Amino acid sequence: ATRFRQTRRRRGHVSMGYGRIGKHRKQRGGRGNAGGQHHRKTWFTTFHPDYFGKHGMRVFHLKANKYYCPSINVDSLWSLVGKDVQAQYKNAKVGEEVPVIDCVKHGYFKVLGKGFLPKQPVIVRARYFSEKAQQKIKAVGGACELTA
Amino acid sequence: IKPKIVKKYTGHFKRFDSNRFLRVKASWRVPRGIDNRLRRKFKGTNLLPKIGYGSAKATRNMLPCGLYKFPVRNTTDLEMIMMQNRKYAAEISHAVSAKKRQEIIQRAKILNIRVLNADARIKKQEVAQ
Amino acid sequence: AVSNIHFCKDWRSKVHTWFKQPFRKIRRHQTRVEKAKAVFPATI
Amino acid sequence: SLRPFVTIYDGITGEAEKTPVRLPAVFLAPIRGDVVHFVYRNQSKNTRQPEGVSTEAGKQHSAISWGTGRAVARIPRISGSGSGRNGQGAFGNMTRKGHMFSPLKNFRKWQRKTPKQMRRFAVASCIAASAVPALVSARGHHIAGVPQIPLVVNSKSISVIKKTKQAVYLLKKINAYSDVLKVIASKTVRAGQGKMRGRKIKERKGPLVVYGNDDLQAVKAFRNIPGVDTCRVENLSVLNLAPGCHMGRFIIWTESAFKKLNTIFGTQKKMAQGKSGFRIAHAQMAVPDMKRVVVAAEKAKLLRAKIVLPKVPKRANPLKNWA
Amino acid sequence: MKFNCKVSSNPSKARKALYTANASQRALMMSARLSKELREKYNVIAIPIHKDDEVKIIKGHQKVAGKVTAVRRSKYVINIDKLTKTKANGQTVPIAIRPSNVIITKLFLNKDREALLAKKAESRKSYKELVAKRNEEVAKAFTAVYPALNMDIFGKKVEPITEKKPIRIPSKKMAEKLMSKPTLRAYKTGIKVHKAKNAIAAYKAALAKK
Amino acid sequence: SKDKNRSSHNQSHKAHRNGFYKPKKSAYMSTKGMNVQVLKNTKAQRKFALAKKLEAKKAA
Amino acid sequence: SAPQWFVPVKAGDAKVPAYYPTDDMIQEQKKKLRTRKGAKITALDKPAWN
Amino acid sequence: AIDLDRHHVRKHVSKTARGNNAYMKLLVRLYGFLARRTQSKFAKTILHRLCLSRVNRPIVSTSKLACLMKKHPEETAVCVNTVTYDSRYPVPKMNVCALKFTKTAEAAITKAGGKCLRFDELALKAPTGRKTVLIRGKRNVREALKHFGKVCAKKNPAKQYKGKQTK
RNA sequence: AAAAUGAAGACAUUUUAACGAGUAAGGAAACGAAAUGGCGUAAGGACAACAAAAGUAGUAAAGAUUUAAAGUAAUUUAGAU
RNA sequence: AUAAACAUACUUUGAAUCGGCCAAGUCUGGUAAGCAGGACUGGCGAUGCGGGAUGAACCGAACGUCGAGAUAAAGUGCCAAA
RNA sequence: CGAGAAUAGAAACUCUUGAAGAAGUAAAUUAUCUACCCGUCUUGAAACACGGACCAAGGAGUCUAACAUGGAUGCGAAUGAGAAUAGCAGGAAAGCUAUAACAUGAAGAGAAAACGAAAAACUAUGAGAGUGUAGAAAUACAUUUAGCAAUAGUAUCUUUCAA
RNA sequence: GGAAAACUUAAAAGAACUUUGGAAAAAGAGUGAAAAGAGCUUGAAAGAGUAAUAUGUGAACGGAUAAUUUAUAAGAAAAAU
């Protein structure tokens, strides 16, 4: 909305809101990220202190598909099936049917351990597990499978 | 009953240097010059519009007859100020024909509503009549 | 934030506008429809 | 949720149908003007056609500035001799026959984007606004003589409409011709430059006839009536329900479209079937009224008494005013 | 509304085709309506005008009847011998009349008007049988759903519905709160105006009853 | 084109417009870089009181 | 009855709306402008308050 | 003239429901009348919070309502904001009054045996506030707060707006 | 700024108190007690005689020249040619 | 002791600006300068009004539109109010 | 003599001018007081500093793309899916529908290998709700309960040579 | 290299005959709803001409306050007992 800008409220003012001593000239210190170490150094020092230099080894053709490992914590495991299913099997133990929360179907590969789990047995089928994730699943009375 | 309508300045606020130059019209413009005589309020030339010049709220936008203004374009427009004939006054629009003006004028007398254009766009009843 | 804009090259001749997108849908659809009319399992 | 009964009338015989229909829950959606204004401001621009000036306009010269020392300005000047054009101004936007300020480009942002769930929030707030006679009349619709403000007609009467004389007859029976004749009687010509581009006649808005899947053959009869715009129940949008960003269009529902409203929008407890992921929201308050809580505190003696500001005394001079 | 994509609704394009039209299409545009006596005999509504045709002027200052002496297709006008103006010095000049302001009274029919009028006669007939077939089919569908009623009800007076059933919706309480300030001061003004109109009408009836 | 090098004129007036921002009380209560044994004593007791309090909460 | 603001006036057979009362049931009134009462008259011997 | 410390400028407190929401304007009118007449700090508190901007009205999840009312069973949590659903932990039985309930939040509270009241219902039942627990969400959990300041700072650095070749 | 009242009055509510200079600069729209208030140019979508002929217009449009009125002002309104 | 609730504490975003000049019961270089450069404060810049005849800085005092009254610097032979 | 208090006491008027033009307003002239050329850079211009003979029309913070803050809006551990694209009625550059790849986010640290979060928390001050007494109209004093937001510090836990 | 220049009327009915003049033209006369008269829809400002009115010693113009002149412009009700 051009009618809502400051140009329409600065009609009549000579400098159009830019000052009389310091005019609105073409450049205010260069074109782009100029002077990264000379006159805009204090800007880069203040707001991007690690902009200049090198760090870490070069990976000539990085395979970002090999680093794709979505993770879900234990506290969010039962939300994969539902709250009604959770209450349906809330009184199961060893010997009877226990629902299997396979996480690869939901797009989660590694299961992490954070938060708390409901006091029910469960079978967690996932590609990778954490050391503290397996403890919480087994301490509640469940099992940790593996896939692929 | 009619109050005293008091105006704090009855003149016109003319644009600075409008009298000297014809390209500069008389419609007011606040001078933004860094060395302008008027905007620095020099003695002799310190006449600028201010909110302090505003007239009393009770008697604002009120015609000398003591009533406000309410434009009308047809007879049905008059029906919106029939309850307030002592507060408003009809003002026929400048484009309303002479034939329609008589119908508005006749109805306004019936509804006891004043008309400010009562002698407007009349026929030639000034000479040879 | 350090800006990274590749507009220093002549982008105005690099601009492609999709004004033909609504008419592309009609053109493709009228080819699928007219392909089955030739022989219906042609577009099978 | 009683959802009171809605009567269905017959277009031809004028007889109300025996079995009423419960009011769909879409009519209970919150009526939010601000949300509708957001959606209407965006979708109103989606019909715009690309435009622009010639990219070579004004800059088709080989002009360079004469420099200083010649008692003329430094604006570029046309080259050569033998014509009055030579030595004149050039490309600059302040000159004559030059380019303008930043010339218009055909790759501007004509069409706008709006979230789908926000688009349905406005439509549900625009269908619900058509059941309020105060808003429908305020929009400029003559609905004094209509039997019911959610005007629903029989699907049997619609199915026999094949000519414009019959469609006009139906509109007269349900007293909808008061709004159709208003558009007919007050159709005028456009003001300004718009008539040079073809837009001459400027009509008003009348009833909107919303039909369903089975009323497709009766559309051709309603389309030639001045100031009567038809639409389908599924294709409803703010461009029809709130024309000019004013809500409360006079909608004339058919039996099939009215009975499909609950399927398309669902209720406040069920998600819509024809709109995956959309459910009618609750207003910020349950009963949008304030007197029911005023009398509750009065009954409980929790409020105080109304205060009239005491007349402050004007300052006097005790050294002279003996009183 | 127009639905053909090969024609344009542009006044500028329409006007240009009217000025660049060749002599072939200028004749068809230059058509006049047959009078009552010729319409009944020929069953033809309008035909392009011809030389020596007799017409009567129905619009203009002088509604005289005369003979066509010139059909100027470039000017899109005709000339009538009766309608002439003296050119100041004494000589007279014809006055141009648009072909749409005249009606033909006597035809000039050498040999081709017989072909044209007969062709334009069967054409009118063939359309009536097409309209008649369509009109009765609509009647067949209507009576098949409304056997008691008749097709003639649409051509007569319509009696509206007098019932005024109200519906309780919990939004009429907020109707004034969803109104913008400009459109609320205009809705409330109409409420006040209507009440004052109704108050006087009620008062007038009391005096009339008295 | 010589210039004026430096002046303190109008600098105390500028500093007292939004005056001397005093540090909050949280600045005086920091305990970084304190005595190592004193820090060990405090951590040892805070772990003793915390365990006792959390055990009573666990029992009920 | 008529509203307090409504003072009916006669119409010289000009066009009038359906709600306006006709002339046969309208009786005109004289415009009143005198509201303040005049001074009281007392005996010839008592001095005036003023 | 007169030597003042400062000139009178508008006080930076909102006193009405921002925006054109016809229902939020009604709640402000309802509680502006309640606070004025009853003169209760609760109605004043609710009126003050109803006029805060959206960014200052943070959400409260069912997990936080569950923990806050664990020792307050016969209570009614009052939070002037949207109430979202925490899908990781169970929802107990509780009555909550809030501006808005998420579809998954309202179902969880209703199924557990609780009640989801709006604000016009609470003013009808407990206008002065009698069985209410005032609850507001966390304000410092915003992602914007990370980048406020100078990242070069030695004590509490900022979070370095990402951009060209951010390592 | 604080008190009072508040679905619609109206003058952007009532009362009280303090305040009112200004270059560069800032105060986008909306927000009932409104998080500054408004005038003007053009174009687009609606509204404009509510009883079925619904804004003005050959009983004279727009424009132009002037005479007066309203507004602190930007400007608006009406008369005459 | 005194003052302070439109107090206090701020948070975020951002404009303009860093050519300055003047006074002095002040200082350094210089013969001195309406010269050059500094410490503290107040001003002009950004500022009109009354007085010094006229004056960016001096004296009184800082400005919404007015009516009436005592006043400030300073004046009371005429210009010029006394 | 006499304050408080109780009983009785009282104000409605003139003259002049005005459709033979009152009060006010406008224009022109006269008289007293008052008034340096506008815009601009500049510490400072009415300046012997520059541009300006006069008038009309045109005339200069716009568009595209990325990020951030902030005010209104929808949904909310999800949000978007007008990504392409495929269908529907209607004939439609408009409208509607598409269990959908992906974008941001739900988990963070390390250069990388390799990993991947609870003592179901603690302390301090703090928002709200009652009860009683009293001033007594307003409201204040005492007591019981509450712990939100925020700030700060603590134990515990993930990654790092190092938090 | 490279311009400028749109518009009588509905219809030319584009004055048509006389007097003055070398002629161009002018005055009548006539056409037309209206000269809109071809330098032709309307016709602004800058610059002039005519008429009315007013003023005057080295600039002119503006503002406050009054006087003079001109213009605008407020009414038909009615006392005590």
Commentary on this structure:
The PDB classes it as ribosome. This is part of a larger assembly, with eight protein chains of eight kinds. Chain A has helices at 41-47, 83-88, 131-139; strands at 71-73, 100-102, 110-112, 123-125, 128-129, 143-145. By secondary structure, chain A is mostly loops. In chain A, the strands form two sheets. Chain A has a three-stranded parallel β-sheet. A three-stranded parallel β-sheet of chain A has the order 2-4-6, covered by helices on one side. The two termini of chain A are 56 Å apart. Chain E is of the alpha+beta class. Chain E is built from five helices and seven strands; from the N terminus they run ααβαββββββαα. A seven-stranded mixed β-sheet of chain E has the order 2-1-7-3-4-5-6. With 50 residues, chain G is largely without helices or strands. The N and C termini of chain G lie far apart (45 Å). Helices cover 29% and strands 14% of the residues of chain H. Chain H contains five helices and five strands, in the order H-H-E-H-E-E-H-E-H-E. In chain H, strands 1, 2, 3, 4 and 5 form a five-stranded parallel β-sheet that branches. Chain H is flat and about 50 Å long. Chain H starts with 23 loop residues before the first helix and ends in a 33-residue tail after the last strand. Chain D binds four RNA strands through helix 1, helix 2 and helix 6.
How would you describe this structure in keywords?
part of a larger assembly, 8 chains, B: 129 residues, little secondary structure, 13% helix, H: 167 residues, alpha/beta, 5-stranded parallel beta sheet, 14% strand, flat, RNA-binding
Describe what is shown at a glance.
The PDB classes it as ribosome. Chain A is largely without helices or strands and 148 residues long.
Order of helix and strand elements from N to C terminus of chain C: H
The strand line-up of the biggest sheet of chain D is 5-10-8-9
* Class computed from helices, strands and strand pairing of chain D: alpha/beta
Oligomer: part of a larger assembly
The global form of chain D is extended
Report the biggest beta sheet of chain C as strand number plus sense, adding barrel if it closes: none
Order of helices and strands of chain D: EEHEEHHEHHHEEEHEHEHHH
PDB class: ribosome
Keywords: 75S Ribosome, A/P-tRNA, P/E-tRNA, Entamoeba histolytica, Ribosome
Entry title: Cryo- EM structure of 75S ribosome with A/P- & P/E- tRNAs from Entamoeba histolytica
Chain A: Large ribosomal subunit protein uL15A
